Structure 1
Amino acid sequence: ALSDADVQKQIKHMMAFIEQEANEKAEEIDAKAEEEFNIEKGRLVQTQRLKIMEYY
C-alpha cells in the first residue's frame, strides 16, 4: 500500500542527513584548505625566510 509515495519521504529524510553534509563536508574541506593555505604560507617558506634572514 505504501508503494513509492512513502519511499519519496524516505529519500527526503535521508537526503537531509547525507546529501547536505556531503556538500558541507566539501565546504569543511574548503575551510581547512584555506586554513592550511595560511599555515603553509607561514611555516615552510617562513622558516626558509628566517634562514636567509640570518644568512643576511
Structure 2
Amino acid sequence: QKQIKHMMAFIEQEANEKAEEIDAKAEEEFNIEKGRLVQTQRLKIMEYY
C-alpha cells in the first residue's frame, strides 16, 4: 500500500531540508571566518611594517 512510500519520501525530505540547512549554515560561517582571519593578519602585517 502507498503510505510506506509517502513515509520514506517524508523522512528523506526532512533530510533534504536538514542537509540544505547545514550547507547554508556552513556558507554563512565561511563568510565570517575569512573576515576574522584576513583582517587580523592584515592589521598584524601593518603593525609590523
- The TM-score, its normalising length taken from structure 2, stands at 0.69
What do residues 13-43 of structure 1 show as CA deviations (whole Å, max 9, x unaligned)? Answer: 4235411110111111110111011011111
After superposition, the CA RMSD in angstroms is 1.8
Count of residue pairs the alignment pairs up:
49
Alignment of 1:3-42 (within 5 A): 8-15=1-8, 17-42=10-35
Unaligned runs of 5+ in 2: none
Moved over 6 A (4+): none
Unaligned runs of 5+ in 1: 1-7
CA–CA separation in structure 2 for the residues paired with 1:9 and 1:50: 62
Q: In terms of Rg, which structure is larger?
A: 1
Q: Percent identity?
A: 100
